From a paper:
Microbes use a diverse set of metal-specific sensors known as metalloregulatory proteins to respond to changes in metal concentration in the immediate environment. Zinc uptake regulator (Zur) is a homolog of one of the first metalloregulatory proteins identified, namely the ferric uptake regulator protein (Fur). Each EcZur monomer includes two domains: an N-terminal DNA-binding domain and a C-terminal dimerization domain. The DNA-binding domain (α2–α4) contains a helix-turn-helix (HTH) motif and is connected to the C-terminal domain (α5/β5) using a characteristic winged-helix motif.
The structure of E. coli Zur (EcZur) protein in complex with a 31 bp duplex derived from the znuABC operator (PznuABC) was determined by X-ray crystallography using multiwavelength anomalous dispersion (MAD) data collected at both high energy and the zinc absorption edge and refined to 2.50 Å. Analysis of the complex reveals the HTH motif interacts with the major and minor grooves of the DNA. Figure 1 shows the final model which includes amino acid residues 5–152 of four protein monomer chains (designated chains A, B, C, D), eight zinc ions, and two 31 bp strands of DNA (designated chains Y and Z) in the asymmetric unit. The three dimensional model of the complex shows the central portion of the operator DNA surrounded by four Zur monomers forming a dimer of dimers. The nature of the dimer of dimers ((Zur2)2) structure indicated that there were two possible orientations for the DNA to adopt in the crystal. Using DNA brominated at asymmetric points indicated that the crystal has an equal mixture of both DNA orientations. Given the pseudo-palindromic nature of the DNA sequence none of the protein-DNA contact sites were affected by this lack of directionality; however, several bases represent an average over the two conformations. Anomalous difference data collected at the Zn edge reveal two distinct Zn2+ binding sites in each of the four Zur monomers: the Zn2+ in site A is bound to four sulfur atoms from Cys103, Cys106, Cys143, and Cys146 and the Zn2+ in site B is bound by residues His77, Cys88, His96, and Glu111. Two salt bridges between adjacent dimers were observed, between Asp49 from monomer A to Arg52 of monomer B, and vice versa. Whereas the overall shape of the crystallized DNA is not greatly distorted from ideal B-form behavior (the bend of the znuABC DNA is ∼15°), two of the largest major groove widths occur at bases 15 (18.3 Å) and 16 (16.8 Å), significantly larger than 11.4 Å for B-form DNA. The Zur-DNA complex provides the first structural evidence that the previously identified closed conformations of the Fur proteins correspond to the conformation capable of binding DNA, and further reveals the molecular basis of protein-DNA recognition in the unusually long operator sequence.
Author numbering:
A (entry chain A): 4 to 152
B (entry chain D): 2 to 152
C (entry chain B): 3 to 152
D (entry chain C): 5 to 152
The structure:
DNA sequence: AGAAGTGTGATATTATAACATTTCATGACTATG
DNA sequence: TAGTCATGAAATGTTATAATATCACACTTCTCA
């Protein structure tokens, strides 16, 4: 039902803006929401084919592009996968991604200090950065407890 | 004054000798070919370069080489792209790094940052997250492309 | 003994006479092509291929098709963007006329050497160097006519 | 010479009580100004300088119209479209000779092929509604280029 | 033996180019009549 | 008083390939008993 609430919320946001949250996009969103965290496009496509048997890569990639242009999903560059954002209605934001290499779970946190260090490092050199990519690989708490036995 | 490109290669050879791992002609050629780049490079571009010498070369060659070089820490993979760059900091003990990437000219700078590792560990510590490795990659413009914008 | 077996055997023999690799994947794709009434799209064929190779993706079927095209086991139907099995692997490269029913979708392949000759002559009048002909007819087949008559 | 055929088109689109919009006319104009085959999306790119709000349905509808009248032919084996040789003649059947190098397309008549196709269809129970006849190779020019 | 390396063809994975249609809301001609 | 025709705008469907990466086998080479 958190999924329901999430979808409703997304519908509300997309209703606010002049943008169309289609059944397809909504479906993809639902699927990704039900997923714990990260997922590749093609596994997601395989999931999508349950409800839309004719679905092909452009379908899911289009849905993702849409959900990416809006603030609903993030790409995970170091795994070629995608995940939901933990907070929707906010604008283009830099967030730090903690990715479990075991379960695929992703925790999204703020890291102003990092942005700042990079902001200064870009300035002590001649760099004008537009965007930071901050992805951490490791193990989440559960998977940590599991890997210790 | 930072370490020269050639010193890194010599250092690579001797380090591989110290570890009893084989820095073969191929892996060496790949290493130098990468070292000549003014920034990151893709596997197939590198493959194309490698062909002028070894035309019989295929992707497995390049990817094997890259896997080896990555394992020995001479090369970094740039994850936001899908490219590979020489490490200009492997003469010291293994390190954390942030890659600064120009979207246009494509050049990249590896710059150390303990202050990032610490914050990441701190953020990872509050949650129960056993951090292992960091990917820090910055996109924007370097102060060559910047002075082309100002015209 | 069955047509499919015989066919795959022929193919296996030809792909041996020629020093070429008829892999399980290619064999499976060909097997599937042989079991079709007529023409099939690359993606329908992919969907069929996924029943045996669940990981299969578009480059898979397109590679298999490119191979089967190179070796002359399948023809591409350009006007419908589809593929059919060749009726006779025995012949070398050949100019084939395709009769395509816009109702049932079935496709019949016919020989027409005359056409090759005419096109060659016509191309030879000008300075055109002919490589391949594309000859496809659209209409209704006998069955669809019988049906439509009522 | 473009204006000539443009006018002729209207003249013929008078006799046949169908409406040739500036849309379809513009498409036909662009098709004419092109000295060879063209894809729908390139044509769409060209149609946009005139009508920047143009989109694929626009050009496709246009092409469907221009196709159904006899002004343009579809080249099935290249998924492209070409202007007719001359559309003063009755609804003919084109045999398209296509250069795989330069992309030049030469429309010719091959009534013999059609005849044969009809006989073959006739010996079957096949009701032949339309034939597609296309050749791929090298135009004379490209041959002479490759000769060197 | 045995572990590591290479050559080669084919396959697997991720993403997009390229080509064509659907939908549905909106306006613009027209056949009664 | 509607009827078809034409368009406008977004999304979707459909076909095919680009771009990235690995597998699987065979042959080998150089080392280890
Ligand atoms: Zn977020
Ligand atoms: Zn975990
Ligand atoms: Zn480094
Ligand atoms: Zn730059
Ligand atoms: Zn045949
Ligand atoms: Zn039929
Ligand atoms: Zn014509
Ligand atoms: Zn030519």
């Amino acid at each position: 039902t958190t999924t329901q609430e999430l979808l409703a919320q997304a519908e509300k946001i997309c209703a606010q803006r002049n943008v169309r949250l289609t059944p397809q996009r909504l479906e993809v969103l639902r699927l990704m929401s039900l997923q714990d965290g990260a997922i590749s496009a093609y596994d997601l496509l395989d999931l999508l084919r349950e409800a839309e048997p004719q679905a092909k890569p452009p379908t899911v990639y289009r849905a993702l592009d849409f959900l990416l242009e809006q603030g609903f999903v993030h790409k995970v560059e170091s795994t070629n996968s995608y995940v939901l954002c933990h907070l929707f209605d906010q604008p283009t934001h830099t967030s730090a991604m903690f990715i479990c290499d075991r379960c695929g779970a992703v925790k999204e946190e703020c890291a102003e200090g990092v942005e700042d260090i990079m902001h200064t490092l870009a300035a002590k050199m001649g760099f004008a950065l537009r965007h930071n990519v901050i992805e951490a690989h490791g193990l989440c708490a559960a998977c940590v407890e599991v890997e210790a036995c």
